[PDB]
């Protein structure tokens, strides 16, 4: 009777895992959280942060060193704050 | 010139990539393309109905694998994630 109950329970596990795939939420959500953190980090690349053009090369190929320095400084400040936010999120999530 | 990291320029659209003739099924008015991350992925050459792919010239961190200098001064480098016919 014990062996029968055991094997039947293993089979039930098989059926459950293959049918109701919502059982692996704990892993799928770690993966989704990392993917969304990375997507935010990549989106932040294409924001002005108050500069005139979110493309470093378009800023370089349009302005002098003096004004380009102000614009590039805005972009660097913004991107660095975004990167620091992402890295802090990663440190916390990796501690978890 | 294709299949090289080339400092391309089109109408001022600049950058660097492995300009590779592509099959981006444009509508003739369309200029370039993108993907999930909104990245420049083509350009209509102002002198040809050519739409080319783009993949940036392979970078990747270097890592130096070494026994302790205590043992020997021999090392071995690990170019990370490069099909290293290209080093």
């Amino acid at each position: 009777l014990i062996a029968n109950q055991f094997n039947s329970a293993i089979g039930k596990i098989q059926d459950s895992l293959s049918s109701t795939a919502s059982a692996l939420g704990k892993l799928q959500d770690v993966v989704n959280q990392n993917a969304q953190a990375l997507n935010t980090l990549v989106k932040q690349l294409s924001s002005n942060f108050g500069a005139i053009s979110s493309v470093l090369n378009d800023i370089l190929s349009r302005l002098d060193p003096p004004e380009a320095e102000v614009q590039i400084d805005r972009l660097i400040t913004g991107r660095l704050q975004s990167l620091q936010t992402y890295v802090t999120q990663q440190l916390i999530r990796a501690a978890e | 010139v294709k299949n090289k990291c080339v400092n391309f320029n089109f109408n001022g659209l600049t950058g660097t990539g492995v300009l590779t003739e592509s099959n981006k099924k444009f509508l003739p008015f369309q200029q370039f393309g993108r993907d999930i991350a909104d990245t420049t992925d083509a350009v209509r050459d102002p002198q040809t109905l050519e739409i080319l792919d783009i993949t940036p010239c392979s970078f990747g961190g270097v890592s130096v694998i070494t026994p302790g200098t205590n043992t020997s001064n021999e090392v071995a480098v690990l170019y990370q994630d490069v099909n290293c016919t290209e080093v």
Binding site: L17, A21, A23, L24, L27, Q28, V31, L38, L41, V42, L45 | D35, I36, A37, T39, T55, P56, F59, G60, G61, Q80, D81
Partner: peptide
């Protein structure tokens, strides 16, 4: 049941999935 070039490299894990399974 479980489902870009800006310096965003993704290092590989040291224990591959088959070594984990072993």
């Amino acid at each position: 049941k479980v489902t870009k070039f800006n310096g965003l490299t993704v290092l590989p894990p040291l224990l591959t999935d088959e070594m984990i399974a072993q």
